[PDB]
Structure 1
Amino acid sequence: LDVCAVVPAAGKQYLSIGNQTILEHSVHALLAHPRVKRVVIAISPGDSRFAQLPLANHPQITVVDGGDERADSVLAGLKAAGDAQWVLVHDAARPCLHQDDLARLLALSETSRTGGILAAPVRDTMKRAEPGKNAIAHTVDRNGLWHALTPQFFPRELLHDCLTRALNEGATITDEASALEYCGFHPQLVEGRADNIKVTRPEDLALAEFYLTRTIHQEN
Structure 2
Amino acid sequence: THLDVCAVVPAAGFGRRMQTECPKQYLSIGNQTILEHSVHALLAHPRVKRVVIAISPGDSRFAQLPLANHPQITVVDGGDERADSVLAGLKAAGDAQWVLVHDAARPCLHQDDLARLLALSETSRTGGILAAPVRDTMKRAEPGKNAIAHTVDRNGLWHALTPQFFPRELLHDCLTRALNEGATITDEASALEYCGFHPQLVEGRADNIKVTRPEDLALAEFYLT
SS of 2:8's equivalent in the other structure is strand
Runs of at least 5 residues in structure 1 that lack an aligned partner in the other structure: 213-219
Residue 191 of structure 1: how far off its partner (Å): 0.4
Residue 139 of structure 1: how far off its partner (Å): 3.1
Residue 124 of structure 1: how far off its partner (Å): 2.3
List structure 1 segments (4+ residues) > 2 angstroms apart after TM superposition. 124-140
Partners of 1:52 and 1:135 in 2: how far apart? Answer: 48
Residue 54 of structure 1: how far off its partner (Å): 1.4
Residue 172 of structure 1: how far off its partner (Å): 1.1
Query: What's the CA shift string for 1:69-122, capped at 9, x where partnerless?
Result: 122111111121111100000001000000000000000000211000000000
Residue 138 of structure 1: how far off its partner (Å): 3.4
Query: What's the CA shift string for 1:34-92, capped at 9, x where partnerless?
Result: 00001000011111011111111111110001111122111111121111100000001
Residue of structure 1 equivalent to 2:197: 185
Residue of structure 2 equivalent to 1:25: 37
Identical columns (%)? 100
Residue 125 of structure 1: how far off its partner (Å): 2.8
TM-score normalized with structure 1 length: 0.93
Partners of 1:162 and 1:22 in 2: how far apart? Answer: 29
Say whether residues 1:87 and 2:99 are aligned partners: yes
SS of 2:209's equivalent in the other structure is coil
Alignment of structure 1 residues 23-172 onto 2, 5 Å: 23-172=35-184
Report the aligned-residue RMSD: 1.4
Distance 1:22 1:166, change over 3 A: same
TM-score normalized with structure 2 length: 0.91
Partners of 1:195 and 1:206 in 2: how far apart? Answer: 13
Residue 168 of structure 1: how far off its partner (Å): 1.2
Number of aligned residue pairs:
212
Partners of 2:218 and 2:154 in 1: how far apart? Answer: 27
Residue of structure 1 equivalent to 2:20: none
- Segment of structure 1 superposing worse, 180-189 or 134-143: 134-143
Partners of 1:164 and 1:139 in 2: how far apart? Answer: 34
Residue of structure 2 equivalent to 1:198: 210
Distance 1:31 1:203, change over 3 A: same
SS of 1:194's equivalent in the other structure is coil
Residue 140 of structure 1: how far off its partner (Å): 2.4
Partners of 2:214 and 2:152 in 1: how far apart? Answer: 26
Say whether residues 1:210 and 2:212 are aligned partners: no
- Segment of structure 1 superposing worse, 203-212 or 146-155: 203-212
Partners of 1:125 and 1:7 in 2: how far apart? Answer: 32
Query: What's the CA shift string for 1:121-158, capped at 9, x where partnerless?
Result: 00123333333344443332111000000000000010
SS of 1:198's equivalent in the other structure is coil
SS of 1:107's equivalent in the other structure is helix
Query: What's the CA shift string for 1:161-208, capped at 9, x where partnerless?
Result: 100110111111110000000000000000000000001111111111
Partners of 1:14 and 1:134 in 2: how far apart? Answer: 35
